Design a binder for this molecule. Structure first.
Ligand code: ZN
Ligand code: ZN
Length: 41
């Protein structure tokens, strides 16, 4: 009904979780994410 802070319907700006961090979750850089960045070393 008002999920505008995410892109859905039912959250009403009161159910927006944040498991990922947009950028990589280990290397520390935006643009890509933990799925795109390999970081195998
Ligand atoms: Zn949402
Ligand atoms: Zn990265």
């Amino acid at each position: 009904v008002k999920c505008f802070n995410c892109g859905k319907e039912g959250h009403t700006a009161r159910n927006h979780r944040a498991p990922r961090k947009k950028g990589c979750w280990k290397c520390g850089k935006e643009g890509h994410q933990m799925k795109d960045c390999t970081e195998r070393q």
